[PDB]
Design an enzyme around this catalytic site. Structure first.
Site, short mmCIF file in Angstrom:
data_model
loop_
_atom_site.label_atom_id
_atom_site.label_comp_id
_atom_site.label_asym_id
_atom_site.label_seq_id
_atom_site.Cartn_x
_atom_site.Cartn_y
_atom_site.Cartn_z
N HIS A 43 2.71 4.13 -5.92
CA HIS A 43 2.59 2.70 -6.04
C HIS A 43 1.11 2.26 -5.99
CE1 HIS A 43 2.29 1.72 -1.63
NE2 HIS A 43 1.50 0.80 -2.16
N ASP A 99 7.68 7.66 -3.27
CA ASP A 99 6.41 7.00 -3.52
C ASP A 99 5.34 8.02 -3.41
OD1 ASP A 99 4.48 5.11 -4.00
OD2 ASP A 99 4.78 4.10 -2.05
N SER A 198 -2.36 2.38 1.84
CA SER A 198 -1.40 3.09 0.99
C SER A 198 -1.96 4.31 0.37
CB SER A 198 -0.83 2.16 -0.11
OG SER A 198 -0.16 1.05 0.42
#
Ligand SMILES: COc1cc(C(=O)N2C[C@H](C)OC[C@@H]2CCO)cc2nc(N[C@H](CF)c3cccc(Cl)c3)oc12
Ligand SMILES: *[C@@H]1O[C@H](CO)[C@@H](O)[C@H](O)[C@H]1NC(C)=O
Lengths: 250, 11, 27
Positions: A43, A99, A198
């Site tokens: 992502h 992810d 992230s």
């Protein structure tokens, strides 16, 4: 990283910064898993809800870093991407299941005091260490609070959370390819990842062989460091067959 | 204006 | 082969300031 601390020098030599070329900004965290492969969250690269669909040429890999913004001459190494590989069953539509992405670098990066890969878990590692209460470590240059950005790499240690607790904290469907971590409100300590963390690593130090293993990838959370909410991490071990497949084929 | 310029060879 | 061993830590038998926190949690 919320409620963490400045990293020590060389503490997380597998830390990678995904750096957007234009604008120059932090795109995400990532990790170095060999001299030419970098692991991150899908992502970070592809998230059509937010018209994210970087290509290789859009980003650099910056390895060996400590300062967020500064160019660490003679310490960091900046690497170009040869190719991105996003998990084909990455579920960006529902819940960020799988992810995970890999990025092959154009050239191997030289290891140094500051640059060094983390291990990926095998089944036994996973099965030993991914236990509720066992703490891992999350690192990143992401925001220091939900609503500001650090001078240097931040570190926080966070306990893995029991799966029913994870599930009960959110309306999102949690999968076996995710685990969650963080303190409970009763627990008094705090900490979480936050925007720009992230794709960075949740790592654990094996007490059996004293090596660091990347057990998770910083995936998502509902805000940062909210009471009763947890960080969700990609289950690296669950996805390692894909990792190996990609690394083996390419 | 946050990030220090990268050596041009990397761009 | 060398993964997950940090030059400035494991390779020198030096611990970082919080890794004991993790070990202590591996009950
Ligand atoms: C598209 O990437 C995201 C999405 C969301 C979101 O709001 N989601 C994803 C959800 C499936 O479904 C709920 C909702 C859907 C929004 O598009 C939250 C997110 N947080 C992050 N990362 C931050 C660090 F940078 C973070 C913060 C705390 C803990 C962790 Cl482990 C990580 O990436 C997020
Ligand atoms: C992402 O970009 C590539 C090339 O730009 C394209 O083939 C692919 O369909 C794009 N995906 C999107 C916008 O979801």
């Amino acid at each position: 990283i919320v409620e963490g601390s400045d990293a020590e020098i060389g503490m997380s030599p597998w830390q990678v910064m995904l750096f957007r070329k234009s604008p120059q900004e932090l795109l995400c965290g990532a990790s170095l898993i060999s001299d030419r492969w970098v692991l991150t969250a899908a992502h970070c690269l592809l998230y059509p809800p937010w018209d994210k669909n970087f290509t290789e040429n859009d980003l650099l890999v910056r390895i060996g870093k400590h300062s967020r913004t500064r160019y660490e001459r003679n310490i960091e190494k900046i690497s170009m991407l040869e190719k991105i590989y996003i998990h084909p069953r990455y579920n960006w539509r529902e819940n960020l299941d799988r992810d995970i992405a890999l990025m092959k670098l154009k050239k191997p990066v030289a290891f140094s005091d500051y640059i060094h890969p983390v291990c990926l878990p095998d089944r036994e590692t996973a099965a030993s260490l991914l236990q509720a209460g066992y703490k891992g470590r999350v690192t990143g240059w992401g925001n220091l609070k939900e609503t500001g950005q650090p001078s240097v790499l931040q570190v926080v240690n966070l306990p893995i959370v029991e799966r029913p607790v994870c599930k009960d904290s959110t309306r999102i469907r949690i999968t076996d390819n995710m685990f969650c971590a963080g303190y409970k409100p009763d627990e008094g300590k705090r900490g979480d990842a936050c925007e720009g963390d992230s794709g960075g690593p949740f790592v654990m130090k094996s007490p059996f062989n004293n090596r660091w293993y990347q057990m998770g990838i910083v995936s998502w959370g509902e805000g940062c460091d909210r009471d009763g909410k947890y960080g969700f991490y990609t289950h690296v071990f669950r996805l390692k067959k894909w990792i190996q497949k990609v690394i083996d084929q390419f | 204006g946050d990030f220090e310029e990268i050596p041009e060879e990397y761009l | 082969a060398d993964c997950g061993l940090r030059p400035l830590f494991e390779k020198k038998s030096l611990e970082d300031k919080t890794e004991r926190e993790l070990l202590e949690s591996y009950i």
